[PDB]
């Protein structure tokens, strides 16, 4: 019987549940400490050793064509090769490689090992002006309405800074700026001092025109540069909340069972909060509430929320897939 | 240590993940616009400059022997040479060449540059009668049951046109035909006017016997000829949905981890929809639902779905490969 | 500009992809049927018309010095000439020639036309005893450990036949022998009847000492002689699986991009299965699994897997080649 | 029909492939052992029986005018005759002859039989000083930039020996020298003892001014004299790698099909490695990497790489040749 029972199954009767995917425990370690954040000094000194076309091309392959690269080689380390990276060995142009690491769900990672989340965080923190000039937005930003918020940002943040607080909230951001100037580590001072000499252009305040473009490649946490600038980390929290809102709307739209509705939604604000508060900061929730009052409605009015397929078509095709797979084998049929 | 660590690795400890393939960013550009479709006027005037044996032989090497040509020289431009193409320089028969371009996953392409998808689209749109006469079906059509749908197409589409809609659906296709006769661009008018004078035989409606043979070489999108014929583009969407259904059944059949099940399935309907709606059309989903109700069951009953190897054999051989590769080097072992 | 653009290029800008090799469609036909196997009655009656020194010398030039002959004249027909072949025209010793045909990747072939795969199949099926006596193994057998499996074959197959099945598996092979004695064509009966009178020594069972030597010259499919002997065709499938295992290990060892890792591995078991099942047989997978359990480990322990060059040397030299070729012309630089 | 079919063709229809050259199996033996290297004791005692003008003149006809001699009489043994070689039979000056043997691709050779590769190896190992004095470089050395590496060799190797290793690498070569003084055969001791009494001047180390001139006549393997001198065999491997690099650049430059690009490149390092490791040595790859870091760039900067003919001219002429040959006969047209 092809759908009877597998070898090595330890129960003689067929279970009521169908079989599923195999969890590979080879790439997992146990002996790591429970809190092991990124180093962020080794990562910035590594990524500032390169020349910016290979960095922007790797950012393009991880953001705009990111789903294809994560579908092709996930669970392995990737070498990036370009003509612009050199190793001058007596005139021979030996290629220098960029190493990212695309981890699995079951995968212990090192402290300085660069995931694509860490890479997008570091590159979007270092070079926002080139991302602004090249209009390089990831598709996960493009579905929550990043483009309409970035059409007229120089007037948008000027109208936001002129609103009265509950004096305008420029004074509130200035008080936040003094509170962060008292409360910062020397590690971020080393990061700013190093990246200034590396040659990237810094950002002084949220009033800069290339300020929303720090979150254009959708980093997983706020970058170490533009951390103590008093109004940027809360703006990344605002965009993470918009991502979770879109995921809950898309999870509630789909007719289906309980576990796939639960599977379709995501927890981005929890991970953003954990990874941001781990860097020595306290997110003020009041500023996030100010952004939600300011442009929470226009973003949700400009979500994507596209119905991809006719539901009568999808139901019929998925039913036919399910009948065929339950005829052939004993696996759980995947979704169309 | 041969499996210790590579040179230029920037972390002193061995990572938990094995190394993988190198992504070459040399053939990628950034400064292209975000939407740059094909020209389709330059491509038709280029491919109608040739003589049909070199076109049908290149179609044979891209469809029937397509996997071997994409394995041999991928990431480069291919010259096709045949005796039938001339350049009469004072009697000297200088060979004229056909240029296709087989792109990589990391590769920006021009507007008029001919990929094999564009080539199969243009050739299958121009010359369906010779493909019908020579019985030239690609192996990706041969696994989703194209042959049994093309055995008796003249009676099949006659029984489909006689069914009552929810008057028969001939009136629905005629209303669709009037709606497309109002809504069409002058560019497709130029394509039809040019390809009529070039000498290829047109198709007037879906009732023609060489109508299913437009999708015999499996184009990536529906061709510019046979676009405004009201019932052909939805039939290509139906075949793309059949391809995605077969890929999901084959992905659910395989015992294995999550990422290789996700790697084995494909997204053909998304690309077909994007590339078809980019040409100035709106696919009516109702006609696709009509085709799925009509012959969705017979196609899935006639899928290939062949078990290629004994799974006990494949598991044993792949385990032995994995043990040997993990003994020798630090790369990720490929699948048998 | 020498690297600017070629004549006859139909696009004014330089493409991102470099140019590649020319595919010659002159030797390809379209009007062949989709399934056209070899005749195998004309081929055996042709190759038994000759005298065995010219056959063994042509087998030597196609197996042991086969890479040089396929590099020199590929895509053409080869005349083999020796003093031992005669045409007695009134005492004049006119030389008789052996015609093989080394086809290209783009090349339609006739039914009775002898490729080197067909030639190695026919010669290794007819004369295994002389190949055993002369120790004539091809280098593609020599890398998958054919010599250690052929050191002590008379004791090896005796220990395999004495193992208990899941009664020993001699009874299983005898049941397979009865099933093949019921199921065989008269064409193979004509082949055995003809080649017995031609003068070659037959093989009765797998217990013969010259039984592994049928696959010493590495045929592409199992020979028509020694087809219905119940245990030989599965042994050729076992050796084809060993070839694919070595090719996947060698493809996974090499640091490089995705398409050249995909290019380095081979699909030998698919072609062996297609060409063997086309001759009127059904390969029992259980016997192949028995061989993999029996001596799958010793063969993989005795693969060649030789690191040909220091990788630091190869990387440096290939980088220098790539820089020079990208300076000179617009072609894709070949591998060192 | 002159292009219809040949007599003795065994297939009634014309094949798609054109006919090619005849492989002559007369000069091939089968019963040789699989490893039969040169004797190198008989060859040195044979070539030291002569007087050096006939040796240098035969070296001139095999290196500098070598292509003409291999075009004229290939596949046969050559007698070399000069006035300087005697046979004193009671005062009569009977001429003594030098016998070389120019073998075919299909040709078994004896152990002591002198091919031109063996001859160039022995003569360039015995007499480097006269080759230095007469400036006798082969044209295959002249295209990979031997002259610029041999302009200032006494300062070049002095700057190489003074570089620090990873202490300078003189200590590394001295450690290699001690390792070879422990590991050498008595056969090479007999060769050095015999050739010292024959009258040729030995070489003590790589620091000698006539040290690069051992590889001026381009031997096929490193000579038996100057084998255990710790730094000379790796220098011959370096020059063989330069030959393979030039052949791959010239193979990638040519527009054409796949098999002639594959035909134009050569495998010299494989044959050099096989024939050198067969003499009882282990090539250290580190020294070859040191030479590639040292003067890999200057040699490739001084390759010949000459475009012999205008490609528009060559394409037109070759097309006209191909049309005429396909009109006349059924052979494959040769390249212009």
Curated annotation (Swiss-Prot), chains A, B, C, D:
Sequence motif YxxL, location on chain: 99-102
Region (Interaction with host DAXX): 280-336
Effect listed in the UniProt record for changing residue 112 to D: No effect on the interaction with host SUMO1 and UBE2I/UBC9
Residues with site note (Important for the endonuclease activity): 9, 24
Signal peptide coordinates: none
Recorded GO MF terms: endonuclease activity; RNA binding
Region (Homomultimerization): 21-46, 280-328
Notes on the domains: The N-terminus is required for chaperone activity and, in trimeric form, this region likely serves in high affinity vRNA panhandle recognition. The N-terminus also contains a coiled coil region, which probably participates in but is insufficient to initiate N trimerization. The YxxL motif is indispensable for the interaction with host MAP1LC3B. The central region is involved in specific RNA-binding. Has distinct cap- and RNA-binding sites so it can bind simultaneously both the vRNA and mRNA cap.
Protein name from the UniProt record: Nucleoprotein
Species of the source: Hantaan virus (strain 76-118) (Korean hemorrhagic fever virus)
Portion of the parent chain present: 80 to 429 of 429
């Amino acid at each position: 019987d092809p759908t009877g029972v597998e070898p090595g199954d330890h129960l003689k009767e067929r279970s009521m549940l169908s079989y599923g995917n195999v969890l590979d425990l080879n790439h997992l370690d146990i002996d790591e400490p429970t809190g092991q954040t990124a180093d962020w000094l080794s990562i910035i000194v590594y990524l500032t050793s390169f020349v910016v076309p290979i960095l922007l091309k790797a950012l393009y392959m991880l953001t705009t064509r990111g789903r294809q690269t994560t579908k092709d080689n996930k669970g392995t380390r990737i070498r990036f090769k370009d003509d612009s990276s050199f190793e001058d060995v007596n005139g021979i142009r030996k290629p220098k490689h960029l190493y990212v690491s695309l981890p699995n769900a079951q995968s212990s990672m090192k402290a300085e090992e660069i995931t694509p989340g860490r890479y997008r965080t570091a590159v979007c923190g270092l070079y926002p002006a080139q991302i602004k000039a090249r209009q390089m937005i990831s598709p996960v930003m493009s579905v929550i309405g990043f483009l309409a918020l970035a059409k007229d940002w120089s007037d948008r943040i000027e109208q936001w800074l002129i609103e009265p607080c509950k004096a305008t909230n420029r004074d509130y951001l200035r008080q936040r700026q003094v509170a962060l100037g008292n409360m910062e580590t020397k590690e971020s001072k080393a990061i700013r001092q190093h990246a200034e000499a590396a040659g990237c252009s810094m950002i002084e305040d949220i009033e800069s025109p290339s300020s929303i473009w720090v979150f254009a490649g959708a980093p997983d946490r706020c970058p170490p540069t533009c951390l103590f600038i008093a109004g940027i980390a809360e703006l990344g929290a605002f965009f993470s909340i918009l991502q979770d809102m879109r995921n809950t709307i898309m999870a509630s739209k789909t007719v289906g069972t309980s576990e796939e509705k639960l599977r379709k939604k995501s927890s981005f604000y929890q991970s953003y909060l954990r990874r941001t508060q781990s860097m020595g900061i306290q997110l003020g929730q009041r500023i996030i509430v100010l952004f939600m009052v300011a442009w929470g409605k226009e973003a949700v009015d400009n979500f994507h929320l596209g119905d991809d397929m006719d539901p009568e078509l999808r139901t019929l095709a998925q039913s036919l897939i399910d009948v065929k797979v339950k005829e052939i084998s004993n696996q759980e049929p995947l979704k169309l």
